[PDB]
Write a protein that binds this ligand. Structure first.
Ligand SMILES: *[C@@H]1O[C@H](CO)[C@@H](O[C@@H]2O[C@H](CO)[C@@H](O[C@@H]3O[C@H](CO)[C@@H](O)[C@H](O[C@@H]4O[C@H](CO)[C@@H](O)[C@H](O)[C@@H]4O)[C@@H]3O)[C@H](O)[C@H]2NC(C)=O)[C@H](O)[C@H]1NC(C)=O
Ligand SMILES: *[C@@H]1O[C@H](CO)[C@@H](O[C@@H]2O[C@H](CO)[C@@H](O[C@H]3O[C@H](CO)[C@@H](O)[C@H](O)[C@@H]3O)[C@H](O)[C@H]2NC(C)=O)[C@H](O)[C@H]1NC(C)=O
Ligand SMILES: *[C@@H]1O[C@H](CO)[C@@H](O[C@@H]2O[C@H](CO)[C@@H](O)[C@H](O)[C@H]2NC(C)=O)[C@H](O)[C@H]1NC(C)=O
Ligand SMILES: Nc1ncnc2c1ncn2[C@@H]1O[C@H](COP(=O)(O)O)[C@@H](O)[C@H]1O
Ligand SMILES: *[C@@H]1O[C@H](CO)[C@@H](O)[C@H](O)[C@H]1NC(C)=O
Ligand SMILES: *[C@@H]1O[C@H](CO)[C@@H](O)[C@H](O)[C@H]1NC(C)=O
Ligand SMILES: [Ca+2]
Ligand SMILES: [Zn+2]
Ligand SMILES: [Zn+2]
Length: 817
C-alpha cells in the first residue's frame, strides 16, 4: 500500500500511485521511479528490484524467474542472492586454466580504455577497486611506453601489429599520402580504404592459423586487410553505450565452439573524452575513471557467471596518456613566418609541416629553408624544427612518405599551430607528445591463466604486446618490431625460447705485414711516446691476451650479423676493436674505464701512428685532414685515457682507431670523453664502453647494405670517404656499484645514437655554457641497445651467463630520468 513493488502501472485505491500521471500530482509511492521507470535505463539490479514483477521495457531482469529465462542483470547474484562479486573475492592463482571444450587454447581479450594515463592508477587507485584488484592479482607495469606520436590510431594499430607507425602506415589520426594523393581522416570514407593499413593485425595472423576473432571496435577491425575482416566486427559508432559493448562480447563467449572467437577486442572512448573536455585533473575525469572501472567490473562479473574468469586472458591497456594544454603554452608559426598561404601545418604537440601545393612540390619544397628560419629564434625556445631523419632514432618516425619531411619536437605541455584559427580550444587536455614523457605513459594489466600473479614488471613498449598475444594464442607471430622473448618474464609458461642470433662469417685475421714507416704528415706533441718496435709491442703472449680479453670484452665481443661483410679483430693493451676492410674504419671498439683511471688534458691533435696490420690509405694520414674544411677525424677508443701512466695512451693513436668526424661533432665527442665518461666512471665504480659509427642513409633504423654504402661515399681531396650518419655509445656497469663492470651479477646499461651533423644548430649553442647542452643532446638521443643492434648490425652480451630472455629484457630497456 506504500510501495509500487508488484503493481507498476496498475490503478490503486490506497493512497500512493504507480502510474505516469502520479508524477505531475506529486502522489507517487516513494519507490515509483526505482521500481517502474529506472529499469528501462539501467543494466543493474538493486534492493528495489530484487524479486520484481518482470517489466516488458526493462533492459535486464531481477525477477525470481530471471535465471530460468537467462536474462538476469549481470550483478543479480551479488545483489539479490548475497553472493560475492568478482572484485569482492580474494586473489587466487590460475595455474591450470578451467576452460570449456574449444578453449584448449584459452581466449585473449584486448580491452582498451582510451587516454587512460598510467598516473591515473598511481594516484586514484583507491577510487578504482576493480582495476586495482586486476593489478594486485595479475601482471602490471607502472608505465607502458606508447609509440610516437601518442595518438589513438597509431597506438591501437601498433598494439595489434607489433609495428612502429612508420612501418604500419597509420602515422596519425590525419595523414596525407603523396603517392595516393589522398587525405586520411577518422570521419572520412578513406578510413575504410585498405591502402592505408600495412603489416598484419593479430586477427589476420589468427585467421591464417585457424582461430576466429570478435572485435567490438578497434582501429583497422572495420577495414578489409589482406582481404580479411575479423569473423565478428562492428562498424565504429561512439554512441553505443559501454554496457552494450561488454554484453555483446559476453554473447560471443557463449557461441558454440565452431563459430566462437579466441581473440576479442573491447574499446571505450573514456577517459580520453573527459580528459580532452575537462583536463586530466578534474571532477569529470574522476567520474569517467570510476565509470570505466565499473565497466571492467561488469566484464569480470559476466565472465564469472559464465565460469570463464579462470579461462580468459585479459589485457587491460590504453593507447596513450593525457596532458593539460594551456593557451599560454601554444606556439604560432605566423609570428615567425607571417600569414603565408603556401604551407599546411598539422597542429598539436606532434606538429608537422607540408606544402599546400601537393603532390607537386611535396619532395621539391624548401623544408631546410623553413627549418633554418625557425631554429634558435629565441632563448629557451619550447619547440624545435627537425627534418624527419634528424629526429631521435628512438622515435622510429621517418621511413614512411606519409611523415611530412619537416616535423616539430615540442617540450612537455607545449603545442604548435600555424595560427590561432587552425587549432581547437588551447585549454583542452591533449596528447601526441614524445612517448617518454611521464603523462603520455599508458595502462597495462594482464590477468588470466597465461599471466603471472602479483608481479610488477619494469617499463616495456606497446610494440612488444603483439608477440605476447601470439604466445597466449599459440600463434607464430608475423615479422614485427617487438623482440620475441623480451616479455617471457610476464608469462607462467613461455612458449618461445629465444636464442642469440648466430654470427654469419667467423672473424678474418689482420696479420702484421713488414712495411716501411711512411710519413702521415703529423706534427705530434713531443710528450707522446711513439711506437718504436711495432712487431715487439703487438706480439702478445696467450697469458697476456686472456688478461686483455677479460678486461675489454667482459660480456664477449660484439658479433656481426651482416651478410656481405669482412671484419678482423685488432688487439691493443687498453681496448679491442672490429675493423672493416670494406669501409676502412672500425665498426666497434670496446674498452673499460676504471674508477681511479687518469684522463689527460694534453693535446694529441694532428698525431697518428701507422698500424702495420692494415694497408695504409690516404684517408688514414694526418695530411688528408690538415686544414681540411669538409671533414676532420676522431678516435673510438680515447687517447685521453691512460691505465699504466698519466700521459697519453699512444696505441689509441693507431690509424685503425679513427673515424671521419665533422668539426662541429668534435665538441660533443671531446666533452663526452674529457668530462662525462670520467663522471660516469666515478658514479658507477667503472664503465665498459662500446662505441662505433652508424650508416643509416635510408633513415629506416637499419644498418645500410655494403652495396648501398658504395654509392654514399663522398669525394674529398680526390679521395672516396664514407662519413657516418650517427655514432653509437653503449655504457655498461653493475646494478650493485660495490662490484665493477668485470664482475656484475646484474648489468645497468645506457645507450646513445648521436646524430653526426655538420653544425650544432639542434642544440642552439649561442650564449650558453658548453657543459649544459651536450648532456641534454645525449639524453634526447638515448636509445635501447636493441635500437643500436638494428642500426649497426651488431649483437652484444652474447657471452653473459643469464638466459637469453633476461638479456632481451635488458636490450629493450630505455632509461627514464
Ligand atoms: C620493423 O619491422 C618491420 C617488419 O619486419 C621491418 O620492415 C621491413 O623492412 C624490410 C626492409 O626495410 C622490408 O623487406 C624487403 O626489403 C627488401 C630489400 O630491398 C626488398 O627486396 C623487399 O621489397 C620487395 O620487392 C619488391 C620491390 O618493391 C616488391 O614488389 C615486393 O613485394 C617486396 O616488397 C622488401 O621491401 C619489409 O617489407 C618491411 N616490412 C614491413 C611490413 O614494413 C622494419 O625494418 C622494422 N623496423 C626497425 C626499425 O627495425
Ligand atoms: C549508433 O549507435 C547508437 C546507439 O546504440 C544508435 O542509436 C539508436 O538507434 C536505435 C535504432 O535501432 C534507436 O532505437 C529504436 O529502435 C526501436 C526498434 O527498432 C524503435 O522502435 C524505436 O524508435 C527505438 O528508439 C535508438 O533511439 C538510438 N539510441 C540512441 C541513444 O540514440 C545508432 O542507430 C547507431 N548508428 C548506426 C550507424 O547504426
Ligand atoms: C590531387 O588531389 C587534388 C585534391 O583533390 C586534386 O585537385 C583538384 O582537382 C579537381 C579536378 O581534378 C578540382 O575540381 C579540385 O578543385 C582540385 N582540388 C584542390 C583542392 O586543388 C588534383 O587534381 C589531384 N591529382 C593530382 C595528381 O594532382
Ligand atoms: N575505430 C575508430 N574509428 C574511428 N574513429 C575512432 C575509432 N576509435 C576511436 N575513434 C575516435 O577517436 C577518438 C580518440 O582520438 P584522440 O582524441 O586522438 O584520442 C575517439 O573519441 C573517437 O571519436
Ligand atoms: C622566414 O621566412 C618568412 C617568409 O615565410 C619571412 O616572413 C621571415 O622574414 C623569415 N625569417 C627569417 C629570415 O628568419
Ligand atoms: C690550419 O690548421 C692549423 C693547425 O693544424 C691551425 O692552427 C690554423 O688555424 C689552420 N689554418 C687555417 C687556414 O685556418
Ligand atoms: Ca638503413
Ligand atoms: Zn586515444
Ligand atoms: Zn584523445
Amino acid at each position: 500500500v506504500k510501495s509500487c513493488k508488484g503493481r507498476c502501472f496498475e490503478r490503486t485505491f490506497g493512497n500512493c500511485r504507480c502510474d505516469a500521471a502520479c508524477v505531475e500530482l506529486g502522489n507517487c509511492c516513494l519507490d515509483y521511479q526505482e521500481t517502474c521507470i529506472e529499469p528501462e535505463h539501467i543494466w543493474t539490479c538493486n534492493k528495489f528490484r530484487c524479486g520484481e514483477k518482470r517489466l516488458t521495457r526493462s533492459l535486464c531482469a531481477c525477477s525470481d524467474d530471471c535465471k530460468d529465462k537467462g536474462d538476469c542483470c549481470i550483478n543479480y547474484s551479488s545483489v539479490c542472492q548475497g553472493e560475492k562479486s568478482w572484485v569482492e573475492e580474494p586473489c587466487e592463482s590460475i595455474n591450470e586454466p578451467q576452460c570449456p571444450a574449444g578453449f584448449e587454447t584459452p581466449p585473449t581479450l584486448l580491452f582498451s580504455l582510451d587516454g587512460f594515463r598510467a598516473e591515473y592508477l598511481h594516484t586514484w587507485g583507491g577510487l578504482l577497486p576493480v582495476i586495482s584488484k586486476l593489478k594486485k592479482c595479475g601482471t602490471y607495469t607502472k608505465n607502458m611506453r606508447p609509440v610516437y606520436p601518442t595518438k589513438t590510431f597509431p597506438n591501437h594499430y601498433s598494439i595489434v601489429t607489433g609495428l612502429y607507425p612508420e612501418s604500419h602506415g597509420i602515422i596519425d589520426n590525419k595523414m596525407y599520402d603523396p603517392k595516393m594523393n589522398a587525405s586520411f581522416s577518422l570521419k572520412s570514407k578513406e578510413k575504410f580504404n585498405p591502402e592505408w593499413y600495412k603489416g598484419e593485425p593479430i586477427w589476420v595472423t589468427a585467421k591464417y592459423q585457424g582461430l576466429k576473432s570478435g572485435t567490438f571496435f578497434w582501429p583497422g577491425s572495420d577495414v578489409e586487410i589482406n582481404g580479411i575482416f575479423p569473423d565478428i566486427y562492428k562498424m565504429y559508432n561512439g554512441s553505443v553505450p559501454f554496457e552494450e559493448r561488454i554484453l555483446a562480447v559476453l554473447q560471443w563467449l557463449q557461441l558454440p565452439k565452431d563459430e566462437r572467437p579466441h581473440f576479442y577486442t573491447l574499446y571505450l572512448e573514456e577517459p580520453d573524452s573527459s580528459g580532452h573536455s575537462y583536463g586530466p585533473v578534474s571532477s569529470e575525469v574522476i567520474k569517467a575513471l570510476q565509470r570505466v572501472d565499473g565497466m571492467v567490473g561488469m566484464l569480470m562479473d559476466g565472465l564469472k557467471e559464465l565460469n570463464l574468469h579462470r579461462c580468459l586472458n585479459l589485457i587491460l591497456i590504453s593507447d596513450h596518456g593525457m596532458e593539460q594544454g594551456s593557451c599560454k603554452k601554444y606556439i604560432y608559426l605566423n609570428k615567425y613566418l607571417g600569414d603565408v598561404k603556401n604551407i599546411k601545418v598539422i597542429y598539436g604537440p606532434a606538429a608537422r609541416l607540408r606544402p599546400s601545393d601537393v603532390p607537386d612540390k611535396y619532395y621539391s619544397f624548401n623544408y631546410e629553408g623553413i627549418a633554418r628560419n625557425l631554429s634558435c629564434r629565441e632563448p629557451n625556445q619550447h619547440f624545435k624544427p627537425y627534418l624527419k631523419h634528424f629526429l631521435p632514432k628512438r622515435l622510429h618516425f621517418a621511413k614512411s612518405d606519409r611523415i611530412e619531411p619537416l616535423t616539430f619536437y615540442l617540450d612537455p605541455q607545449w603545442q604548435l599551430a600555424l595560427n590561432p584559427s587552425e587549432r581547437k580550444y588551447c585549454g583542452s587536455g591533449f596528447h601526441g607528445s614524445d612517448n617518454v614523457f611521464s603523462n603520455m605513459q599508458a595502462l597495462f594489466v594482464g590477468y588470466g591463466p597465461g599471466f603471472k600473479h602479483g608481479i610488477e614488471a619494469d617499463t616495456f613498449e606497446n610494440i612488444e604486446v603483439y608477440n605476447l598475444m601470439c604466445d597466449l594464442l599459440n600463434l607464430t607471430p608475423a615479422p614485427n618490431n617487438g623482440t620475441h622473448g623480451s616479455l617471457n618474464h610476464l608469462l607462467k609458461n613461455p612458449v618461445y625460447t629465444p636464442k642469440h642470433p648466430k654470427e654469419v662469417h667467423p672473424l678474418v685475421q689482420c696479420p702484421f705485414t713488414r712495411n716501411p714507416r711512411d710519413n702521415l704528415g703529423c706534427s705530434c706533441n713531443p710528450s707522446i711516446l711513439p711506437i718504436e718496435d711495432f712487431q715487439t709491442q703487438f706480439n702478445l703472449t696467450v697469458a697476456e691476451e686472456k688478461i686483455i680479453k677479460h678486461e675489454t670484452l667482459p660480456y664477449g665481443r660484439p658479433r656481426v650479423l651482416q651478410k656481405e661483410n669482412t671484419i678482423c679483430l685488432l688487439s691493443q693493451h687498453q681496448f679491442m676493436s672490429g675493423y672493416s676492410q670494406d669501409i676502412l674504419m672500425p665498426l666497434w671498439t670496446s674498452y673499460t674505464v676504471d674508477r681511479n683511471d687518469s684522463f689527460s688534458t694534453e693535446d694529441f691533435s694532428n698525431c697518428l701512428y701507422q698500424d702495420f696490420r692494415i694497408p695504409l690509405s690516404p684517408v688514414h694520414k694526418c695530411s688528408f685532414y690538415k686544414n681540411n674544411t669538409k671533414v676532420s677525424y676522431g678516435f673510438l677508443s680515447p687517447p685521453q685515457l691512460n691505465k699504466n701512466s698519466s700521459g697519453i695512451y699512444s696505441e689509441a693513436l693507431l690509424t685503425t682507431n679513427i673515424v671521419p668526424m665533422y668539426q662541429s661533432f668534435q665538441v660533443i665527442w671531446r666533452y663526452f670523453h674529457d668530462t662525462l665518461l670520467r663522471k660516469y666512471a666515478e658514479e658507477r665504480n667503472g664503465v665498459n664502453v662500446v662505441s662505433g659509427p652508424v650508416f643509416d642513409f635510408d633513415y629506416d633504423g637499419r644498418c645500410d647494405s655494403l652495396e648501398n654504402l658504395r654509392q654514399k661515399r663522398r669525394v674529398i681531396r680526390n679521395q672516396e670517404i664514407l662519413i657516418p650518419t650517427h655514432f653509437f655509445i653503449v655504457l655498461t656497469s653493475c646494478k650493485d656499484t660495490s662490484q665493477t663492470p668485470l664482475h656484475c651479477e646484474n648489468l645497468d646499461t645506457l645507450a646513445f645514437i648521436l646524430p653526426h651533423r655538420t653544425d650544432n644548430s639542434e642544440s642552439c649553442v649561442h650564449g650558453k655554457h658548453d657543459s649544459s647542452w651536450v648532456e641534454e643532446l645525449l639524453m634526447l638521443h638515448r636509445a635501447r641497445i636493441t635500437d643500436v643492434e638494428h642500426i649497426t648490425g651488431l649483437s652484444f652480451y652474447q657471452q653473459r651467463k643469464e638466459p637469453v630472455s633476461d638479456i632481451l629484457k635488458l636490450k629493450t630497456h630505455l632509461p627514464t630520468f
